[PDB]
Amino acid sequence: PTFYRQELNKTIWEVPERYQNLSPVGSGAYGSVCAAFDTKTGHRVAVKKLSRPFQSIIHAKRTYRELRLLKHMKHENVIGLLDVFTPARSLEEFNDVYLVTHLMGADLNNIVKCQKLTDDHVQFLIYQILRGLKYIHSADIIHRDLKPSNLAVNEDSELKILDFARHTDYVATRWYRAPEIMLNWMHYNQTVDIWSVGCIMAELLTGRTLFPGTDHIDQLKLILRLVGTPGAELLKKISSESARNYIQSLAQMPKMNFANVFIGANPLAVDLLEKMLVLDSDKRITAAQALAHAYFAQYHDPDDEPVADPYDQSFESRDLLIDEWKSLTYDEVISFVPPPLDQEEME
Ligand SMILES: Nc1nccc(-c2c(-c3ccc(F)cc3)ncn2C2CCNCC2)n1
Ligand SMILES: CCCNS(=O)(=O)c1ccc(N2C(=O)C=CC2=O)cc1
Ligand SMILES: [Ca+2]
Ligand SMILES: [Ca+2]
Ligand SMILES: [Ca+2]
């Protein structure tokens, strides 16, 4: 294919002539994104140019990680790949990676900002998050930083999870993070993401951030004001003695009845929130269980809530050289098989 060059976000993009009318639509994890028109199919796409993918051992493994993950994700509520390309003609020239997915116009913050959502609409939005989470969790993939800005949404309220790192190479919101993540507790499970769903859903119902803490201690205090002081057994999860002593020293707070907090909400929504927003992560409802909850009765369809194929993450424990990660990434670019344009059939 013929490539052309265009300066976007102050850097040269080099893309096949198949993709036209590129214009920036913001940054993603380790990359920046442009909307484009795919002249082969007439579809609107988003193209992410990875930022400096092989600049360091951290970037190189992150690049491989992201490409492997996105090549595996095949679910209507999870960002996956229509195409992956590089202007490189060989491994020796290979320094840039572009990922292509269907264009989504907005994020969840654009949905709830200027609209009092109906309960039926909130149901649909949360349902889709949970359906996507069931799929990713079934492949032993945890998001760990689920939040409205990591939920891409189109003009019809269809939603996809994205941006789901080992090493430190921007100030992120922590308001949606599970307590065990935010405070670095020693162990956690897939239900970290269910806490985040609870935080998101609460905000869709009230129009207000549930736990808008100014720092991690203020956020913890806001959380405990809602869910109540936890037992000693939760201290078992916390390595730092200073942290444990502090939590233990706090004045004891009762759990609030969520029906007194979410005034006017559908009682089924309140019940679901009670099942998601619990500190005991082993008692937190799972994504698959939440999909069966009566709150989603009008959307739930067990024939259309699939799980993922097994996902081999053994590479995560390996230290390889930068050129080895680069070569493996090149292999994954070259081996990518685009999906059919139409992959769905009437039920
Ligand atoms: N507009 C739009 N549409 C779809 C996805 C994205 C996208 C991607 C991304 C990921 C993989 C890929 F192959 C192509 C793009 N990464 C971050 N974003 C965000 C850009 C700003 N927030 C909303 C989504 N943006
Ligand atoms: C963070 C809650 C603090 N309490 S609040 O800000 O006053 C409040 C705001 C909105 C609601 N609500 C629902 O729950 C459903 C419809 C609706 O109006 C309830 C409470
Ligand atoms: Ca259906
Ligand atoms: Ca079809
Ligand atoms: Ca069916």
Q: State the DSSP string of 210-249.
A: S---SSHHHHHHHHHHHH-PPPHHHHTT---HHHHHHHHH
The domain made up of 106-296 has a fold known as: Transferase(Phosphotransferase); domain 1 (1.10.510)
| Deposited experimental method | X-ray
Ligand 1 pocket member 28 (CB < 6 A): yes
Residue minimizing CA distance to atom 2 of ligand 1: 104
Distance in Å, CA 28 to ligand 1 centroid: 6
**Please, which residues have CB within 8 angstroms of residue 161's CB and are 6 or more apart in sequence?**
77, 78, 79, 129, 132, 133, 136, 143, 146, 150, 151, 152
Q: Are 286 and 190 in contact (CB under 8 A)?
A: yes
Dihedral in degrees, nearest 10, Cα atoms 88, 38, 101, 92: 0
Annotated binding site for ATP: 25-33, 48
Ligand nearest to the CA of 70: 1
Task: List gaps in the chain by the residue before each (C–N > 2.5 Å).
Answer: 164, 169
Dihedral in degrees, nearest 10, Cα atoms 199, 112, 172, 55: 120
Element (H, E) at 31: strand 31-38
Nearest Cα to 103, choosing from 191, 162, 51? 162
DSSP state of 334: H
Ligand 2 probe mutation, 126, 199, 262, 277, most atoms within 8 A of CB: 262
Q: Are 33 and 101 in contact (CB under 8 A)?
A: no
Q: Atom of ligand 2 at shortest distance to CA of 266?
A: 15
78 strand-pairing partners: 161
Tokens of 202: 């609460």
CA distance 290 to 275: 9
Distances in Å between the Cα of 311 and the Cα atoms of 71, 128, 152, 307, 332 are 11, 22, 23, 11, 15
Q: Atom of ligand 1 at shortest distance to CA of 35?
A: 1
Tokens of 327: 């070569």
Q: Are 31 and 51 in contact (CB under 8 A)?
A: yes
Long-range pairs, 246-252, Cβ under 8 A, ≥24: 246/217, 247/220, 250/221, 250/224
Helix/strand/coil for 95: coil
**Please, which residues have CB within 8 angstroms of residue 77's CB and are 6 or more apart in sequence?**
128, 129, 131, 132, 135, 159, 160, 161
Ligand 1 pocket member 190 (CB < 6 A): no
Phi, psi of 235 (to 5 degrees): -60, -25
Ligand 1 pocket member 33 (CB < 6 A): yes
CA distance 20 to 17: 7
Task: Examine the residue annotation and report whether 319 is marked as an active-site residue of this protein.
Answer: no
Ligand 1 pocket member 73 (CB < 6 A): no
Q: Are 221 and 213 in contact (CB under 8 A)?
A: yes
- Give the experimental resolution in Å: 1.4
Q: Are 301 and 130 in contact (CB under 8 A)?
A: no
Return the number of other C-beta atoms located less than 10 Å from residue 197's C-beta: 24
Catalytic entry in 140, 163, 304, 331 = 163
| Amino acid (one-letter) located at 211 | F
Ligand 1 pocket member 50 (CB < 6 A): no
CA distance 339 to 336: 9
| Amino acid (one-letter) located at 151 | L
Ligand 1 probe mutation, 25, 27, 32, 33, most atoms within 8 A of CB: 33
Tokens of 243: 């942290």
Instruction: Show the DSSP H helices in the chain as ranges.
Output: 57-72, 108-112, 119-138, 179-182, 192-206, 216-227, 232-235, 241-249, 267-276, 287-291, 322-335
CA distance 63 to 95: 11
